[PDB]
Amino acid sequence: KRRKTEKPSLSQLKSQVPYPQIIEWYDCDARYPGLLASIKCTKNVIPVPSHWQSKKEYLSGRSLLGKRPFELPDIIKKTNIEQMRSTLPALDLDYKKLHDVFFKIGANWKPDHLLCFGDVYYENRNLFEETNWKRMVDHKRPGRISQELRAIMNLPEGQLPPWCMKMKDIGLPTGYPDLKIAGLNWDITNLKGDVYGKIIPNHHRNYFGALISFETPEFE
Amino acid sequence: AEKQRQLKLQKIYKQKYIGLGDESTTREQWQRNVRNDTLNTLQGHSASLEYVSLSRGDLSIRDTRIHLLKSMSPGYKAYLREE
Amino acid sequence: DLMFFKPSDHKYFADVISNKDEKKERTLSMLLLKIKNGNTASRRTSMRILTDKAVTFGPEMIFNRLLPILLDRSLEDQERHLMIKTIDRVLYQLGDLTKPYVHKILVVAAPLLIDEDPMVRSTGQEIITNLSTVAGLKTILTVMRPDIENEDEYVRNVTSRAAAVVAKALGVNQLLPFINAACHSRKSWKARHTGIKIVQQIGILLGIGVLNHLTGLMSCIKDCLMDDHVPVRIVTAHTLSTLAENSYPYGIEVFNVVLEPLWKGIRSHRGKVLSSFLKAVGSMIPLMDPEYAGYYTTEAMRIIRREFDSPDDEMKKTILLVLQKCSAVESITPKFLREEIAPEFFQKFWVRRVALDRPLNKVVTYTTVTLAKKLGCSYTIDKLLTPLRDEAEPFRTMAVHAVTRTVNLLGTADLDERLETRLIDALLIAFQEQTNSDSIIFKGFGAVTVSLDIRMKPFLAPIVSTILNHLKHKTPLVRQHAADLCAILIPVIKNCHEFEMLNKLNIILYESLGEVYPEVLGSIINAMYCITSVMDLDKLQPPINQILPTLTPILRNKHRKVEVNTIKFVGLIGKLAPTYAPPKEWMRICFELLELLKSTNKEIRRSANATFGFIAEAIGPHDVLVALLNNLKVQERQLRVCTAVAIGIVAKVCGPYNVLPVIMNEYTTPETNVQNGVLKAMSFMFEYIGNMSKDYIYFITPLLEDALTDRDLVHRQTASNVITHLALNCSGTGHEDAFIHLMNLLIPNIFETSPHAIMRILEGLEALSQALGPGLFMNYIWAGLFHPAKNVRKAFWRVYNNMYVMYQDAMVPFYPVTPDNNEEYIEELDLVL
Amino acid sequence: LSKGENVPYTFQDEQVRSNPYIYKNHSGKLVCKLCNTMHMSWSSVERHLGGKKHGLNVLRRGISIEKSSDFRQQQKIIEAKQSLKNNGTIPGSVGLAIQVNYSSEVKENSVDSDDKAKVPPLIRIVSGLELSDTKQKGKKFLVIAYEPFENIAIELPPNEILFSENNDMDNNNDGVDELNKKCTFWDAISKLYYVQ
Amino acid sequence: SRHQFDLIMCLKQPGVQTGLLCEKCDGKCPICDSYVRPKRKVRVCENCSFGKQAKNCIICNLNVGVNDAFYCWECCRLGKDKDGCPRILNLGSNRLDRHFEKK
Amino acid sequence: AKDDELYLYHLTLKKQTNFVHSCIGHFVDLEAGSKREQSQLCVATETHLELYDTADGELKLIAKFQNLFATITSMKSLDLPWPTFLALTSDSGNLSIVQIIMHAGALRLKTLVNQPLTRTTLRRVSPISYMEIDPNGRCIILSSVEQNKLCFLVDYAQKLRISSPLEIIRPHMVTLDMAVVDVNFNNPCFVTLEIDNAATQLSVHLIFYVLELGLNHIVKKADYLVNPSANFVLSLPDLSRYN
Ligand SMILES: [Zn+2]
Ligand SMILES: [Zn+2]
Ligand SMILES: [Zn+2]
Ligand SMILES: [Zn+2]
């Protein structure tokens, strides 16, 4: 009773904290709030996954209904057993082939997503969309437009995007000062296919561990 | 039954290994375990013991070791205060 | 369902034959009936409901209705134990009970300790040791005082043992003054008696732990032994026997007090009183000091020799014990024993009437074997040759046992050629002439033949003549007996280089392999196993490739031992002879085992799984995996799990590079049970490879991606089991970045309930502690370490308890503790030089 | 118990389903996408469907759809009656009039148990967008129905004819609809249904 | 044990003695009951040996064991090897209801 | 893509020089057919281990033994009524009694019995860091800085035999400075300074223990409270001539 009503306000607790935004309303009933704020707000600690205080047993997810059953890592998919055995609604293969897939072909191979120091998987999360996202931030760059989005845009080949004219009056993108586009800052004769422009960088090892040779263990 | 066994193993592991936070443990009880284990390792490794000896600048190293031993008990602060 | 109605005990329940106190009152007795008389599926539920609600129901009605049930004579060992289990679970649940109901329960479950079976003795001990913490010292002491004064020998015996179990549960230091009360009590005679026996069962239950407590008890022995009551004096002498044997030679310094009156009791009271006294002193003999041992042994041996003629059973049993212990004394010489003790031993105690009663035959044999150490082995067996050729079959059995235990320890190397001949002659005689059905003769005979081997050849031939002679016989008992003897004698024949003789053995046994009797057929296949294992395959007569196709139908013989020795031998051909049997025949083997392992035997099932390693080494691993994965789809759990084991062993012998890709597809299959079998097969295939998984770890993580994320607590469970072995054996390889991922998916599962899920996840996180190191694993544990939720806290302090158990110094640098974080901190961490 | 129906997995990227709800997820279990409930066996699935829980979620989903924006015992001899179409005209436009004749107490002598016997024939305008064959379409039909006899249709290419404007003085006995009361007559004594 | 829950352990400081297991239980790591790559022989406190009880299988507590029990390499790294004296003091509900079930 | 994955090869060029433990026993008999002399010493720094002789009045490297790959937290020689071999306690809790032997053309260190204790780490419960042996070599005693103390009764035979551990457990008493008193074979007696872990005031109290070979357990004898200023204990052998 008295101890329950003795609690300091969470904002009174914020001042003790160097990173006050992590502390939350429920920290008021922390039996040792001044300590718990220091631990929770300590540098490298990773806050408890928030699926607690929910009674849903951490997975009720509607998204769980729409998750793909599985996908082979493409290196293993090269092994062709996908066609040999149909998992969807004998199969002998070469020892050298399989062994080389894991070792010769797949030594340097690593899953593309993984996760980071403090990455924690909440129920509603799905990594796959973020994998295509990270891969997409990689492939796609300004000045280039795929033929699909080009067809939807109804832009014929050899013709500049509609924002090149408004970009002539307004100016180059503030975010891309080094961006070049045919007809304006960049040679129109170099206009080719899906690329109407490219960023021209103005910036222009061994890491003590350079192996200088790569030799995998041989099965034979 | 299973959880009930985990209670008994909680009593046994707590007996052997001393401080193990069960569910509710006061910060005074637990921080004492922290201090005791940290000092325990500082004096336990001849390495870190040699290190604290020099950085502290004591005349002998066993002064630092038995210092840590004494520093394990809470009343040693007031003991230093009474010197 | 209320299966198996009990008319009398149900009409004893009354209650509902067709108001919260009436509802709990009714449903409670209804559940009790569900446990006692009901359906297994029903009673299993009533147990969980009765334990969950056990705190809700009043122990007054619980025990009021429950306890008197066990007072009837119509109870059965099944049902009485079904109620006993509820007694244990409820007493350990409520944890606090009033003294009258404590007395009631202790009286009810008290007789359980006296029951003939240690099965009931155990649970009878469990109820009492659980009740002890509930009631406490003072309550139980107030319970035993009015009972020890009872005039009933039965009940006094009961609460003697019960009081002992209490003394062990709460410690004998707290209950010891009570022992001094009933011990030293001048009032009642039976109080003295039982007060002494309680010391007996305390000594038995504590075992070696009686040492530190032995001071207070020997007070009761020394003061209460002097009582003029003969039964008291006897029971004290038995207490000296138990506390000396459990004592072990340490306690002599304390026993020196009671050492003196034993002898003046011996030289005077004689009789059964001297039986108990010589039991006590005999138990004192090993703990005696070498000089004192020298004196008191020489003092006792005269009384022993004089008492050789005792017509009584008990005194003879004691004498054999005293010789048994005194044999270890260095003072008495083997010359002394051979000149006096031994000749007056073998003639007196080996009379045929001795062999008639087993419980005496035990002490006779063990005593004789203890004599064999000091005595010359050739002299002992020399005296043991005449009892072998006697016409009494049980006397021949005891005669065998003595040879077995004697030759195992010493060996026959002491025997001369002549009596060595007469030995094997006698063994063959008694072996071929044996009337009774017993398993000892081939075992011990085999032990002799293993002891002396090169010397056997001229006997080795006739022994095998008797072997075949019994291999053709009309009694399956002698059949399987002789076959068991064959399998034992096979390795010895190799030492004589008789190998063609092993070939004709292989012939005859292989031809008799078509016998109808399974019990003999299994032993025959065992002899086949020893033969094929010993002798080179190329020179085997049948040959092997002809042997195995006759074995393939054997697997369906059901029973047990047939598949035990059959799977053993098929495995032997699996590792030894890859080439002989054709690969299609090996595939027939795979199908047969795949059907066979539904059997309930863990030996048949485990060895069956092990043979797939040899079959996978000989034949196509993919060929095996087709059948295995096809069998994963079956609903039966033993099939799924032990096919997963087979996949694991095949992945061990073949290597994961073959097995894993197809496994991952079998996981791509949508079926749950199949995915489970996949994940477990992945666990086992990883635990069987210590250094292999390091290169395979990355290809696993996208599979565990859908596993740990899956909604089913089963898939999350078995995936965590994968992370256990994978993390333990891959720890320190440098894959921590992958381990970081795998953990990041685990942390949300910490709050998941259920015992299996919680322990699998705990073990998984502990495996991650080794692969990541505490620091990051810590960081999670810290940011969740206290927390308000009272639930989150209880959950994470489990992981932090295990972490504190495995690692302490490892966590020392990683405590997030700063001078503002805690008051005292440590002044020495900030020191920089 | 499955009645031989094939329930495709959720990930198979949708043949019409009986109930487009119960699916099988990546695992073998069966689920109700709306209810988000897992079911071990098809019997449990049927308990779910017959349960009030699922129904409530169905009504909630129908409310979501609105937010996003006697039939058994029907006698049927399927007998084509005789229609008498005729181009009419009044004032000020052109309208159609149909004269449908019915049995002459030939077979209606065995059924007279006041079972909708008082109910007159009914007309409705149906779009050809839905047919048992679904081949061609794009025009309306003035369907006319009576319990025993077989339905009858009349194609109306003209977008609008005789579609009047407040013919009577707004009297509200809806009967079935404005169409029926507005422009139909049922000579029940002679069994002649006129429509215009 | 890892599987049967009600089984209680000893957990005292192990002595020089080595625990025995029967041929029936042969091959199991007494903690995890694993058959793979055993490492170190089990050691039990003297309080679990003494007389006849020393001959019992430290796993199933009933049969008389010939063989020595070894910890696996996973328990030897998890440190459960050195935790204490493994033994099963109570026979367990499984074995109990088995014996009472048959007879 | 080239995997960075720096692969480092660790070598100890010069081995740890701070000598934390020593023992006086005579281990190997070298260069002499039959010789028995108590003058020799073996000294250990954590991992690294060395064995020196004098016999000339000038110390001599004997052999630098192989790296043990552990933290030796105490080392004491034992002499039993024979070649004197040293009892060695380290991390893993194992009490490892090792004899230095001559094998092939070099001196190698052979282990006889290692007894598992506690777990593998440097711990306070770990019965290490305080060790001593009966000066007559009848028993070895290990203790912990805090929790518990274990004493083995050592016996020699055709094969060495370590008796079961003798346990004493005092929960809150932090142990420091184990010092064992020599005896005439009467009974082994060891002495410690126990500082209470949980107390309102700082209290450092000496405590005596007599291990009873008769009753086979350690017995608390005299608990004497001394000022908190206490440092260490040493054993006065007899005072048999005085009272
Ligand atoms: Zn639904
Ligand atoms: Zn034990
Ligand atoms: Zn066993
Ligand atoms: Zn293990």
UniProtKB/Swiss-Prot annotation, chain A:
Q: Which domain of life is it from?
A: Eukaryota
| Lineage start | Eukaryota, Fungi, Dikarya, Ascomycota, Saccharomycotina
**Keyword flag Phosphoprotein:** yes
Q: Which residues of the full protein are shown?
A: 125 to 376 of 436
Q: Which UniProt keywords apply?
A: mRNA processing, Nucleus, Phosphoprotein, RNA-binding
Identify the coding gene: CUS1
Job of this protein: Essential splicing protein required for U2 snRNP binding to pre-mRNA during spliceosome assembly.
Mind listing the GO molecular function terms for this protein?
Answer: RNA binding
- Cite a GO CC annotation: precatalytic spliceosome
Miscellaneous: Present with 1830 molecules/cell in log phase SD medium.
Q: Which family does it belong to?
A: To mammalian SAP 145. Some, to C.elegans ZK632.11.
Cell compartment(s), UniProt: Nucleus
Q: List the disulfide bonds.
A: none
**Keyword RNA-binding in annotation:** yes
Q: What is this protein called?
A: Cold sensitive U2 snRNA suppressor 1
Give the multimer and partner information: Belongs to the CWC complex (or CEF1-associated complex), a spliceosome sub-complex reminiscent of a late-stage spliceosome composed of the U2, U5 and U6 snRNAs and at least BUD13, BUD31, BRR2, CDC40, CEF1, CLF1, CUS1, CWC2, CWC15, CWC21, CWC22, CWC23, CWC24, CWC25, CWC27, ECM2, HSH155, IST3, ISY1, LEA1, MSL1, NTC20, PRP8, PRP9, PRP11, PRP19, PRP21, PRP22, PRP45, PRP46, SLU7, SMB1, SMD1, SMD2, SMD3, SMX2, SMX3, SNT309, SNU114, SPP2, SYF1, SYF2, RSE1 and YJU2. Interacts with RDS3.
Q: Which GO terms describe its biological process?
A: mRNA splicing, via spliceosome; spliceosomal complex assembly; U2-type prespliceosome assembly
From Swiss-Prot, chain B:
First-listed, main subcellular location of the protein, grouped into a coarse class:
nucleus
Q: Pfam families in the record, alphabetically?
A: SF3b10
Report the record's disulfide bonds.
Answer: none
An example Gene Ontology biological process:
spliceosomal complex assembly
Q: Name one GO cellular component term.
A: nucleus
Q: Which domain of life is it from?
A: Eukaryota
Q: Where in the cell is it found?
A: Nucleus
Entry keywords, A to Z:
mRNA processing, mRNA splicing, Nucleus
Coiled-coil positions are: none
Which residue ranges traverse the bilayer? Answer: none
What binding partners and quaternary form does the record give? Belongs to the SF3b complex composed of CUS1, HSH49, HSH155, RCP1, RDS3 and RSE1.
Q: What is its biological role?
A: Involved in pre-mRNA splicing. Required for the SF3b integrity and prespliceosome assembly.
**Protein name in the entry:** RDS3 complex subunit 10
UniProtKB/Swiss-Prot annotation, chain D:
Keywords for this protein: Metal-binding, mRNA processing, mRNA splicing, Nucleus, Spliceosome, Zinc, Zinc-finger
Please indicate if the UniProt record lists Methyltransferase as a keyword. Answer: no
Give the note.
Present with 3460 molecules/cell in log phase SD medium.
> Zinc finger (Matrin-type) locations?
30-60
Quote the subunit structure annotation. Answer: Belongs to the CWC complex (or CEF1-associated complex), a spliceosome sub-complex reminiscent of a late-stage spliceosome composed of the U2, U5 and U6 snRNAs and at least BUD13, BUD31, BRR2, CDC40, CEF1, CLF1, CUS1, CWC2, CWC15, CWC21, CWC22, CWC23, CWC24, CWC25, CWC27, ECM2, HSH155, IST3, ISY1, LEA1, MSL1, NTC20, PRP8, PRP9, PRP11, PRP19, PRP21, PRP22, PRP45, PRP46, SLU7, SMB1, SMD1, SMD2, SMD3, SMX2, SMX3, SNT309, SNU114, SPP2, SYF1, SYF2, RSE1 and YJU2. Interacts with CUS2.
Query: Single Gene Ontology BP term?
Result: mRNA splicing, via spliceosome
Q: Which family does it belong to?
A: Belongs to the SF3A2 family.
Task: Specify the protein name.
Answer: Pre-mRNA-splicing factor PRP11
Single GO MF annotation: zinc ion binding
Subcellular compartments: Nucleus
Q: Name one GO cellular component term.
A: catalytic step 2 spliceosome
- Location (main, coarse): nucleus
**What domain of life?**
Eukaryota
Described by its record, this protein's role is as follows: mRNA splicing factors, PRP9, PRP11, and PRP21, are necessary for addition of the U2 snRNP to the pre-mRNA in an early step of spliceosome assembly.
Which gene is transcribed and translated to give this protein?
PRP11
UniProtKB/Swiss-Prot annotation, chain F:
The subcellular localization recorded is: Nucleus
Q: Which domain of life is it from?
A: Eukaryota
What functional role does this protein have?
Answer: Involved in G2/M transition. Required for pre-mRNA splicing and endoplasmic reticulum (ER) to Golgi secretion pathway. U2 snRNPs associated protein required for the pre-spliceosome assembly. The involvement in ER to Golgi secretion is probably indirect and due to the splicing of the pre-mRNA coding for SAR1, a small GTP-binding protein required for COPII vesicle formation from the ER.
Q: Which family does it belong to?
A: Belongs to the RSE1 family.
Q: How does it assemble?
A: Belongs to the SF3B complex, a U2 associated sub-complex of the spliceosome. The SF3B complex is composed of at least CUS1, HSH49, HSH155, RDS3 and RSE1.
Any idea what this protein is called? Pre-mRNA-splicing factor RSE1
Species this protein is from = Saccharomyces cerevisiae (strain ATCC 204508 / S288c) (Baker's yeast)
- Report which part of the complete sequence is shown: 53 to 305 of 1361
